[PDB]
Design a protein around this nucleic acid. Sequence first.
RNA 1: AUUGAAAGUUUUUUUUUUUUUUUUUUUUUUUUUUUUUUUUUUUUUUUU
Length: 126
Amino acid sequence: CPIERLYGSNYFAGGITISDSVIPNASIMERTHVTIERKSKKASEKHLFSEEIIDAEKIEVKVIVRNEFELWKNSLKLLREIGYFIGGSKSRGIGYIVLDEKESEYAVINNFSETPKFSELKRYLS
RNA sequence: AUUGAAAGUUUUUUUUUUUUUUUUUUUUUUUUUUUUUUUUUUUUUUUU
């Protein structure tokens, strides 16, 4: 299965290493919510849902893949146009990322005697 | 040249779903555009 060969399994080696995306920015705002009684349009005095939200514009994540799979290229291509959601309450307009081909960059390493070179992601993906 | 040694605590798992800051609330109630001022004065229906 290509998916297992890429992401690993209970006994499989793996193949992909993903770093986190810690952001020095800590701009955190609060977006409260209320439930409306369907029988009568008013606030249901049972709870006051309150949800945090981390506003951001560019999420930088470093990803290393040890399997030059056309599956990976196709996944990145799908993220280029359609784009998927990340994080909770994605059904409520919270979290929707789209990969760009301008800021993001890649690098292919085949020789271990040369310094890796980064170039625009468009050349790799387009 | 330790009795003596050589093994990554590693793989694998999205903190996710349910929820409209909503209903009610007429920028109105009152206040006379009035108030003092003469369309007045001067002029022969008239001569060789």
